[PDB]
PDB file of C-alpha atoms in Angstrom:
ATOM      1  CA  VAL A   1       5.912  86.160  -0.085  1.00 26.04           C
ATOM      2  CA  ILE A   2       5.417  85.149   3.545  1.00 26.23           C
ATOM      3  CA  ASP A   3       3.172  87.677   5.282  1.00 25.54           C
ATOM      4  CA  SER A   4       3.440  86.805   8.986  1.00 26.27           C
ATOM      5  CA  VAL A   5       5.083  83.934  10.872  1.00 30.51           C
ATOM      6  CA  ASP A   6       3.655  82.705  14.174  1.00 26.40           C
ATOM      7  CA  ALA A   7       4.632  79.733  16.314  1.00 22.33           C
ATOM      8  CA  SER A   8       1.147  78.260  15.763  1.00 24.90           C
ATOM      9  CA  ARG A   9       0.360  79.264  12.164  1.00 21.69           C
ATOM     10  CA  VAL A  10       1.997  80.616   9.008  1.00 24.03           C
ATOM     11  CA  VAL A  11       0.168  82.855   6.520  1.00 23.22           C
ATOM     12  CA  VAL A  12       1.677  83.610   3.109  1.00 28.14           C
ATOM     13  CA  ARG A  13       0.759  86.204   0.484  1.00 30.96           C
ATOM     14  CA  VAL A  14       0.297  84.543  -2.904  1.00 34.63           C
ATOM     15  CA  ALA A  15       2.281  86.069  -5.758  1.00 30.65           C
ATOM     16  CA  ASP A  16       0.591  88.100  -8.487  1.00 29.53           C
ATOM     17  CA  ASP A  17       1.288  85.469 -11.179  1.00 27.68           C
ATOM     18  CA  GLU A  18       0.202  82.206  -9.501  1.00 26.08           C
ATOM     19  CA  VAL A  19      -3.459  83.083  -8.930  1.00 26.09           C
ATOM     20  CA  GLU A  20      -6.238  81.072 -10.563  1.00 27.56           C
ATOM     21  CA  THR A  21      -9.035  83.612 -10.040  1.00 31.47           C
ATOM     22  CA  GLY A  22      -8.992  87.394 -10.424  1.00 33.19           C
ATOM     23  CA  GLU A  23      -8.162  88.325  -6.833  1.00 34.06           C
ATOM     24  CA  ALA A  24      -5.148  88.542  -4.516  1.00 33.63           C
ATOM     25  CA  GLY A  25      -5.355  85.178  -2.754  1.00 31.72           C
ATOM     26  CA  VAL A  26      -4.126  84.313   0.746  1.00 31.70           C
ATOM     27  CA  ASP A  27      -3.013  80.874   1.950  1.00 33.46           C
ATOM     28  CA  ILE A  28      -3.041  80.124   5.688  1.00 32.17           C
ATOM     29  CA  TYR A  29      -1.240  77.087   7.121  1.00 31.35           C
ATOM     30  CA  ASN A  30      -2.122  76.106  10.692  1.00 35.66           C
ATOM     31  CA  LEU A  31       0.741  74.322  12.439  1.00 33.19           C
ATOM     32  CA  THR A  32       0.086  71.200  14.499  1.00 30.99           C
ATOM     33  CA  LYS A  33       1.047  71.758  18.137  1.00 29.89           C
ATOM     34  CA  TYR A  34       1.821  69.084  20.741  1.00 27.10           C
ATOM     35  CA  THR A  35      -0.488  66.164  19.943  1.00 24.74           C
ATOM     36  CA  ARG A  36      -0.495  62.466  20.778  1.00 26.88           C
ATOM     37  CA  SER A  37       0.612  59.823  18.282  1.00 29.16           C
ATOM     38  CA  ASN A  38      -0.432  56.185  17.967  1.00 27.41           C
ATOM     39  CA  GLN A  39       2.737  55.151  19.844  1.00 24.93           C
ATOM     40  CA  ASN A  40       2.286  57.709  22.668  1.00 24.30           C
ATOM     41  CA  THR A  41       4.921  60.054  21.241  1.00 23.86           C
ATOM     42  CA  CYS A  42       5.014  63.793  20.582  1.00 26.20           C
ATOM     43  CA  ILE A  43       4.136  65.396  17.239  1.00 27.23           C
ATOM     44  CA  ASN A  44       4.555  69.125  16.615  1.00 23.69           C
ATOM     45  CA  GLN A  45       5.672  71.481  13.855  1.00 21.71           C
ATOM     46  CA  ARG A  46       8.039  74.448  14.085  1.00 20.41           C
ATOM     47  CA  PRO A  47       8.204  77.300  11.548  1.00 23.64           C
ATOM     48  CA  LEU A  48      11.252  77.659   9.320  1.00 22.98           C
TER      49      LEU A  48
ATOM     50  CA  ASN B   1      64.191  65.919  51.036  1.00 19.43           C
ATOM     51  CA  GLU B   2      63.970  69.381  49.451  1.00 18.14           C
ATOM     52  CA  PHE B   3      61.025  70.718  47.448  1.00 18.79           C
ATOM     53  CA  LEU B   4      60.402  74.022  45.669  1.00 18.91           C
ATOM     54  CA  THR B   5      57.022  75.345  46.789  1.00 19.78           C
ATOM     55  CA  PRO B   6      55.206  76.965  43.830  1.00 20.94           C
ATOM     56  CA  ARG B   7      54.162  80.488  44.902  1.00 19.83           C
ATOM     57  CA  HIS B   8      53.199  82.421  41.758  1.00 16.43           C
ATOM     58  CA  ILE B   9      50.186  83.056  39.537  1.00 16.47           C
ATOM     59  CA  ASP B  10      50.844  83.906  35.876  1.00 16.98           C
ATOM     60  CA  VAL B  11      47.563  84.233  33.958  1.00 14.37           C
ATOM     61  CA  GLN B  12      47.544  85.091  30.242  1.00 14.82           C
ATOM     62  CA  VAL B  13      44.067  86.382  29.378  1.00 13.59           C
ATOM     63  CA  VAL B  14      43.492  86.481  25.615  1.00 14.11           C
ATOM     64  CA  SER B  15      39.703  86.803  25.843  1.00 15.70           C
ATOM     65  CA  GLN B  16      36.817  86.283  28.251  1.00 14.69           C
ATOM     66  CA  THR B  17      37.258  82.544  27.606  1.00 13.95           C
ATOM     67  CA  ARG B  18      40.286  80.290  27.071  1.00 14.91           C
ATOM     68  CA  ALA B  19      42.615  81.825  29.660  1.00 12.19           C
ATOM     69  CA  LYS B  20      46.039  80.157  29.723  1.00 16.02           C
ATOM     70  CA  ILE B  21      47.669  80.115  33.161  1.00 15.53           C
ATOM     71  CA  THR B  22      51.113  79.022  34.350  1.00 14.09           C
ATOM     72  CA  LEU B  23      51.430  78.402  38.086  1.00 15.17           C
ATOM     73  CA  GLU B  24      55.184  78.096  38.706  1.00 14.17           C
ATOM     74  CA  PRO B  25      58.179  75.792  38.101  1.00 16.52           C
ATOM     75  CA  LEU B  26      57.148  72.566  39.833  1.00 14.26           C
ATOM     76  CA  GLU B  27      59.378  69.759  41.076  1.00 14.98           C
ATOM     77  CA  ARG B  28      60.439  66.905  38.813  1.00 15.35           C
ATOM     78  CA  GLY B  29      57.449  64.582  38.516  1.00 15.16           C
ATOM     79  CA  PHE B  30      54.830  66.990  39.902  1.00 14.61           C
ATOM     80  CA  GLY B  31      53.668  68.140  36.466  1.00 16.33           C
ATOM     81  CA  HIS B  32      51.282  65.226  35.956  1.00 18.68           C
ATOM     82  CA  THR B  33      50.240  64.347  39.519  1.00 17.24           C
ATOM     83  CA  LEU B  34      49.285  68.003  40.077  1.00 16.54           C
ATOM     84  CA  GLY B  35      48.046  68.906  36.597  1.00 14.63           C
ATOM     85  CA  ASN B  36      45.629  65.993  36.297  1.00 15.66           C
ATOM     86  CA  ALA B  37      44.506  66.596  39.884  1.00 17.68           C
ATOM     87  CA  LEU B  38      43.585  70.221  39.159  1.00 17.69           C
ATOM     88  CA  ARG B  39      41.732  69.197  35.991  1.00 20.99           C
ATOM     89  CA  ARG B  40      39.519  66.731  37.877  1.00 22.37           C
ATOM     90  CA  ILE B  41      38.653  69.470  40.400  1.00 20.69           C
ATOM     91  CA  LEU B  42      37.762  72.265  37.969  1.00 17.71           C
ATOM     92  CA  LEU B  43      35.612  70.117  35.667  1.00 16.86           C
ATOM     93  CA  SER B  44      33.888  68.518  38.684  1.00 14.61           C
ATOM     94  CA  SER B  45      32.745  71.194  41.146  1.00 14.98           C
ATOM     95  CA  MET B  46      32.934  74.958  40.587  1.00 14.77           C
ATOM     96  CA  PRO B  47      30.249  77.375  41.842  1.00 17.60           C
ATOM     97  CA  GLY B  48      28.116  78.942  39.134  1.00 13.54           C
ATOM     98  CA  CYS B  49      24.808  80.670  38.465  1.00 15.02           C
ATOM     99  CA  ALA B  50      21.902  79.303  36.441  1.00 13.76           C
ATOM    100  CA  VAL B  51      18.191  79.981  36.007  1.00 12.03           C
ATOM    101  CA  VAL B  52      16.298  77.422  38.101  1.00  8.20           C
ATOM    102  CA  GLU B  53      12.735  78.668  37.504  1.00  9.90           C
ATOM    103  CA  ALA B  54      11.000  80.931  34.983  1.00 10.00           C
ATOM    104  CA  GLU B  55       7.434  82.213  35.376  1.00 10.31           C
ATOM    105  CA  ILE B  56       5.518  83.636  32.405  1.00 10.39           C
ATOM    106  CA  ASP B  57       2.228  85.423  33.077  1.00 10.13           C
ATOM    107  CA  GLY B  58       0.557  84.151  29.897  1.00  9.33           C
ATOM    108  CA  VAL B  59       1.316  80.437  29.588  1.00  8.31           C
ATOM    109  CA  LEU B  60       0.310  77.529  31.829  1.00  9.22           C
ATOM    110  CA  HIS B  61       2.646  74.673  30.843  1.00 11.10           C
ATOM    111  CA  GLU B  62       5.872  74.625  28.843  1.00  8.51           C
ATOM    112  CA  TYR B  63       4.254  72.708  25.959  1.00 12.26           C
ATOM    113  CA  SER B  64       1.554  75.202  24.955  1.00 12.94           C
ATOM    114  CA  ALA B  65       2.849  78.062  22.811  1.00 11.16           C
ATOM    115  CA  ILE B  66       1.972  81.758  23.020  1.00 10.77           C
ATOM    116  CA  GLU B  67       0.744  84.013  20.233  1.00 12.86           C
ATOM    117  CA  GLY B  68       2.916  86.689  18.656  1.00 15.77           C
ATOM    118  CA  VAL B  69       6.205  84.853  19.221  1.00 14.07           C
ATOM    119  CA  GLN B  70       8.094  82.527  16.880  1.00 16.99           C
ATOM    120  CA  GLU B  71      10.016  80.253  19.257  1.00 16.48           C
ATOM    121  CA  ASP B  72       8.072  77.788  21.373  1.00 13.66           C
ATOM    122  CA  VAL B  73       8.049  77.929  25.170  1.00 14.05           C
ATOM    123  CA  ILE B  74      10.343  74.892  25.301  1.00 17.69           C
ATOM    124  CA  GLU B  75      12.717  76.678  22.919  1.00 19.13           C
ATOM    125  CA  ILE B  76      12.578  79.828  25.062  1.00 18.67           C
ATOM    126  CA  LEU B  77      13.420  77.906  28.240  1.00 16.81           C
ATOM    127  CA  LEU B  78      16.229  76.100  26.404  1.00 15.95           C
ATOM    128  CA  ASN B  79      17.715  79.481  25.441  1.00 17.39           C
ATOM    129  CA  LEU B  80      17.784  80.523  29.111  1.00 19.97           C
ATOM    130  CA  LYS B  81      20.199  77.686  29.968  1.00 19.12           C
ATOM    131  CA  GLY B  82      22.951  79.420  27.981  1.00 17.19           C
ATOM    132  CA  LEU B  83      23.060  82.640  29.994  1.00 16.95           C
ATOM    133  CA  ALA B  84      26.274  83.705  31.741  1.00 14.96           C
ATOM    134  CA  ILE B  85      24.989  85.328  34.940  1.00 16.30           C
ATOM    135  CA  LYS B  86      27.309  86.478  37.734  1.00 13.91           C
ATOM    136  CA  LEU B  87      26.056  87.151  41.265  1.00 12.26           C
ATOM    137  CA  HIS B  88      28.139  89.359  43.561  1.00  8.98           C
ATOM    138  CA  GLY B  89      26.463  89.661  46.961  1.00  8.06           C
ATOM    139  CA  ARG B  90      23.362  87.475  46.727  1.00 10.15           C
ATOM    140  CA  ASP B  91      22.559  83.768  46.670  1.00 10.13           C
ATOM    141  CA  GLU B  92      19.190  83.938  44.872  1.00  7.53           C
ATOM    142  CA  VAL B  93      17.858  86.883  42.861  1.00  6.04           C
ATOM    143  CA  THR B  94      14.690  87.410  40.813  1.00  5.65           C
ATOM    144  CA  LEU B  95      15.037  88.999  37.369  1.00  3.31           C
ATOM    145  CA  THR B  96      12.289  90.182  35.032  1.00  2.00           C
ATOM    146  CA  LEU B  97      11.849  90.667  31.293  1.00  2.00           C
ATOM    147  CA  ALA B  98       9.161  92.603  29.421  1.00  3.14           C
ATOM    148  CA  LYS B  99       9.436  93.705  25.787  1.00  2.00           C
ATOM    149  CA  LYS B 100       6.782  94.530  23.186  1.00  3.86           C
ATOM    150  CA  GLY B 101       6.778  95.130  19.445  1.00  2.00           C
ATOM    151  CA  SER B 102       8.599  93.332  16.646  1.00  2.00           C
ATOM    152  CA  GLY B 103      11.982  93.115  18.327  1.00  2.00           C
ATOM    153  CA  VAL B 104      14.489  90.331  18.849  1.00  2.00           C
ATOM    154  CA  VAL B 105      14.522  89.596  22.582  1.00  2.00           C
ATOM    155  CA  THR B 106      18.138  89.241  23.724  1.00  2.00           C
ATOM    156  CA  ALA B 107      19.852  88.890  27.093  1.00  2.00           C
ATOM    157  CA  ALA B 108      20.353  92.673  27.307  1.00  2.00           C
ATOM    158  CA  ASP B 109      16.597  93.317  27.604  1.00  2.00           C
ATOM    159  CA  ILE B 110      16.568  91.995  31.187  1.00  2.00           C
ATOM    160  CA  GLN B 111      16.157  94.710  33.810  1.00  2.00           C
ATOM    161  CA  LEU B 112      19.511  95.805  35.201  1.00  2.50           C
ATOM    162  CA  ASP B 113      20.443  95.049  38.805  1.00  3.94           C
ATOM    163  CA  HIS B 114      23.297  96.052  41.086  1.00  3.04           C
ATOM    164  CA  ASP B 115      24.178  92.506  42.200  1.00  3.02           C
ATOM    165  CA  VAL B 116      23.451  90.838  38.830  1.00  2.00           C
ATOM    166  CA  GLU B 117      25.757  90.894  35.801  1.00  2.00           C
ATOM    167  CA  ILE B 118      25.143  89.226  32.430  1.00  2.00           C
ATOM    168  CA  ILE B 119      28.228  88.503  30.337  1.00  2.00           C
ATOM    169  CA  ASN B 120      26.643  87.524  27.013  1.00  2.00           C
ATOM    170  CA  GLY B 121      24.467  90.332  25.671  1.00  2.00           C
ATOM    171  CA  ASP B 122      24.031  89.061  22.113  1.00  2.00           C
ATOM    172  CA  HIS B 123      22.361  85.793  23.179  1.00  2.00           C
ATOM    173  CA  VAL B 124      19.039  85.612  21.336  1.00  2.00           C
ATOM    174  CA  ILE B 125      16.234  84.395  23.602  1.00  2.00           C
ATOM    175  CA  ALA B 126      13.121  84.768  21.449  1.00  2.00           C
ATOM    176  CA  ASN B 127      11.874  86.555  18.333  1.00  2.00           C
ATOM    177  CA  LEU B 128       8.732  88.669  18.674  1.00  2.00           C
ATOM    178  CA  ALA B 129       6.321  90.175  16.154  1.00  2.00           C
ATOM    179  CA  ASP B 130       3.615  92.827  15.959  1.00  2.00           C
ATOM    180  CA  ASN B 131       0.982  90.223  16.902  1.00  2.00           C
ATOM    181  CA  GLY B 132       1.897  89.950  20.583  1.00  2.00           C
ATOM    182  CA  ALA B 133       4.540  90.307  23.269  1.00  2.00           C
ATOM    183  CA  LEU B 134       5.979  88.348  26.191  1.00  2.00           C
ATOM    184  CA  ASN B 135       6.703  89.055  29.852  1.00  2.00           C
ATOM    185  CA  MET B 136       8.407  86.671  32.266  1.00  2.00           C
ATOM    186  CA  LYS B 137      10.307  86.520  35.549  1.00  2.00           C
ATOM    187  CA  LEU B 138      13.636  84.740  36.030  1.00  2.00           C
ATOM    188  CA  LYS B 139      14.962  83.243  39.274  1.00  2.00           C
ATOM    189  CA  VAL B 140      18.628  82.243  39.496  1.00  2.00           C
ATOM    190  CA  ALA B 141      20.463  80.586  42.374  1.00  2.00           C
ATOM    191  CA  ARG B 142      23.882  79.323  43.456  1.00  2.00           C
ATOM    192  CA  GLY B 143      24.907  75.720  42.904  1.00  2.00           C
ATOM    193  CA  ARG B 144      27.818  73.324  42.426  1.00  2.00           C
ATOM    194  CA  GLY B 145      26.885  70.746  39.784  1.00  2.00           C
ATOM    195  CA  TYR B 146      24.067  69.391  37.629  1.00  2.00           C
ATOM    196  CA  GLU B 147      20.739  69.309  39.482  1.00  2.00           C
ATOM    197  CA  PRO B 148      17.584  68.364  37.537  1.00  2.00           C
ATOM    198  CA  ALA B 149      14.079  69.522  38.371  1.00  2.00           C
ATOM    199  CA  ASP B 150      13.072  66.081  39.674  1.00  2.00           C
ATOM    200  CA  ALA B 151      15.805  66.049  42.342  1.00  2.00           C
ATOM    201  CA  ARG B 152      15.212  69.695  43.319  1.00  2.00           C
ATOM    202  CA  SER B 153       0.098  78.537  40.952  1.00  2.00           C
ATOM    203  CA  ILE B 154       0.397  76.312  37.871  1.00  2.00           C
ATOM    204  CA  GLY B 155       2.561  78.893  36.090  1.00  2.00           C
ATOM    205  CA  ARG B 156       5.822  77.863  37.771  1.00  2.00           C
ATOM    206  CA  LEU B 157       8.147  76.313  35.166  1.00  2.00           C
ATOM    207  CA  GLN B 158      11.161  74.590  36.716  1.00  2.00           C
ATOM    208  CA  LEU B 159      14.349  74.133  34.698  1.00  2.00           C
ATOM    209  CA  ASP B 160      17.239  71.678  34.916  1.00  2.00           C
ATOM    210  CA  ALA B 161      20.126  73.946  35.913  1.00  2.00           C
ATOM    211  CA  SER B 162      23.842  73.228  35.449  1.00  2.00           C
ATOM    212  CA  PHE B 163      26.012  75.315  37.795  1.00  2.00           C
ATOM    213  CA  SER B 164      29.329  74.801  36.030  1.00  2.00           C
ATOM    214  CA  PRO B 165      31.234  77.702  34.421  1.00  2.00           C
ATOM    215  CA  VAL B 166      34.106  75.586  33.054  1.00  2.00           C
ATOM    216  CA  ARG B 167      33.782  74.033  29.596  1.00  2.00           C
ATOM    217  CA  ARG B 168      37.125  72.477  28.612  1.00  3.38           C
ATOM    218  CA  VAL B 169      40.342  72.034  30.602  1.00  2.00           C
ATOM    219  CA  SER B 170      43.668  70.848  29.182  1.00  2.00           C
ATOM    220  CA  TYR B 171      47.213  70.903  30.533  1.00  2.00           C
ATOM    221  CA  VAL B 172      50.734  70.471  29.162  1.00  2.00           C
ATOM    222  CA  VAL B 173      54.029  70.036  31.010  1.00  2.00           C
ATOM    223  CA  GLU B 174      57.107  71.857  29.697  1.00  4.49           C
ATOM    224  CA  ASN B 175      60.619  72.445  31.025  1.00  3.91           C
ATOM    225  CA  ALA B 176      61.509  75.281  33.399  1.00  5.22           C
ATOM    226  CA  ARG B 177      64.759  76.788  34.661  1.00  7.05           C
ATOM    227  CA  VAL B 178      65.333  79.061  37.667  1.00  5.62           C
ATOM    228  CA  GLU B 179      69.173  78.918  37.629  1.00  6.85           C
ATOM    229  CA  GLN B 180      69.019  76.757  40.782  1.00  4.02           C
ATOM    230  CA  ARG B 181      68.324  73.189  39.603  1.00  5.39           C
ATOM    231  CA  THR B 182      68.566  71.306  36.307  1.00  4.41           C
ATOM    232  CA  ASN B 183      65.359  69.224  36.104  1.00  6.84           C
ATOM    233  CA  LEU B 184      62.379  71.503  36.770  1.00  5.97           C
ATOM    234  CA  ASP B 185      59.020  71.544  34.993  1.00  6.75           C
ATOM    235  CA  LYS B 186      56.201  74.073  34.708  1.00  6.49           C
ATOM    236  CA  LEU B 187      52.456  73.481  34.429  1.00  7.31           C
ATOM    237  CA  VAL B 188      50.272  75.317  31.898  1.00 10.27           C
ATOM    238  CA  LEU B 189      46.486  75.026  32.236  1.00 10.19           C
ATOM    239  CA  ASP B 190      44.379  75.831  29.168  1.00  9.22           C
ATOM    240  CA  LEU B 191      41.281  76.691  31.170  1.00  7.98           C
ATOM    241  CA  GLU B 192      38.203  77.686  29.151  1.00  4.17           C
ATOM    242  CA  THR B 193      35.040  78.995  30.814  1.00  3.13           C
ATOM    243  CA  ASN B 194      31.914  80.998  29.947  1.00  2.00           C
ATOM    244  CA  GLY B 195      33.400  84.234  31.301  1.00  4.16           C
ATOM    245  CA  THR B 196      31.606  84.053  34.654  1.00  4.68           C
ATOM    246  CA  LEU B 197      34.404  83.413  37.162  1.00  7.47           C
ATOM    247  CA  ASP B 198      37.973  84.695  37.208  1.00  4.73           C
ATOM    248  CA  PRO B 199      40.579  82.160  36.005  1.00  2.23           C
ATOM    249  CA  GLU B 200      42.963  83.422  38.692  1.00  2.84           C
ATOM    250  CA  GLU B 201      40.268  82.865  41.338  1.00  2.00           C
ATOM    251  CA  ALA B 202      39.474  79.353  40.071  1.00  3.89           C
ATOM    252  CA  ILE B 203      42.949  78.039  40.925  1.00  4.76           C
ATOM    253  CA  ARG B 204      42.822  79.357  44.494  1.00  5.75           C
ATOM    254  CA  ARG B 205      39.349  77.825  44.803  1.00  6.71           C
ATOM    255  CA  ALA B 206      40.535  74.470  43.436  1.00  6.68           C
ATOM    256  CA  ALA B 207      43.619  74.459  45.673  1.00  7.25           C
ATOM    257  CA  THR B 208      41.374  74.922  48.718  1.00  6.94           C
ATOM    258  CA  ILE B 209      39.210  71.920  47.794  1.00  8.29           C
ATOM    259  CA  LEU B 210      42.250  69.646  47.514  1.00  9.57           C
ATOM    260  CA  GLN B 211      43.742  71.000  50.747  1.00  8.68           C
ATOM    261  CA  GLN B 212      40.476  70.453  52.634  1.00  8.16           C
ATOM    262  CA  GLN B 213      40.299  66.829  51.452  1.00 11.28           C
ATOM    263  CA  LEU B 214      43.875  66.225  52.666  1.00  9.60           C
ATOM    264  CA  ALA B 215      43.695  68.062  56.003  1.00  9.87           C
ATOM    265  CA  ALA B 216      41.276  65.416  57.302  1.00 10.23           C
ATOM    266  CA  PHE B 217      43.467  62.645  55.844  1.00 13.33           C
TER     267      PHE B 217
END
């Protein structure tokens, strides 16, 4: 279940069944903001 | 010869947009030379209101995002270009917006003013969260057509404003009868706007533009 959604990062709460160890588990995905590409173009990610 | 001067204004308002009007029974042949002329005047130049500059007290440039919000600053500024703002007795006002908490920021959260009226109140601007909040100032002005920011301290974010309330104009020519002549036609304009200006006031404004371009002829 997704915990909190930000324009710069997305943190999800791992389900109780898909955990390798014996803890809760939290996955954090940092979104790439406006960066330069090899062809001088824009690259950024937007949450869905 | 003899001509029947159209002096009547029949407006059928079904909603805030798509107002069907019917001027009067025109003369034979004046359904197309007057209907297509009025269409090229409404879709060309009609005064409107648009946000020309937005200043946020937390962000420097429109590319960097702010924490606590979901939409990017570019997406927030792009949502401001869809506001239907109506100014009554001013040419340039300065609005403000400040909301905290996990609430969907809409167009109704802007501080109320006496000379400012917002038609769309369900227009979503940005989505907040418990992480942070936003606060910005809006500056609208009066214009006539499309004017980009290039042809118009570091926190000033200029926007490309389009001062045009009309969206789609169509006209049909039917038959009319006033028990005086046999061949008389009427003109029906299917004017559709964003609800800013009055459809009955747009015809009198368009008739003045055509009359001013012919008085000097």
